[PDB]
């Protein structure tokens with residue numbers, strides 16, 4: 732396991748602690764979010780991020796950050812602002828980026 736894999740696994744653990752319901756733990760299904768796949772072109776979730784770390788697909792912290800932001804932007808695109816999902820996404824986006832400096 733490489734230094735980047737170790738750091739990104741660390742960051743991912745810390746970020747998932749901010750989502751205790753696991754709303755971001757797995758790909759959003761169309762069953763839970765009607766029409767999701769037709770609206771969101773590039774889905775992302777923490778579980779996919781973990782698989783990408785294990786597969787050694789991230790070669791920089793920038794790339795990991797970009798996936799994290801994608802995940803949050805998707806939730807802010809799909810959901811109305813008055814929803815737990817939009818608010819959580821916005822919160823964890825800023826906290827996450829700070830956390831990761």
Ligand SMILES: Cn1cc(-c2cccc(C(F)(F)F)c2)c2sc(/C(N)=N/C3CCS(=O)(=O)CC3)cc2c1=O
Pocket residue numbers: 753754755759763764765805806809810811814816
């Ligand atoms: C990231 N994310 C996650 C969920 C989600 C995933 C698993 C389980 C659950 C739960 F058990 F809590 F229901 C929710 C959902 S569900 C959803 C959904 N149905 N959202 C609607 C909220 C009301 S609205 O008028 O904004 C239309 C979208 C969006 C997302 C999401 O982005």
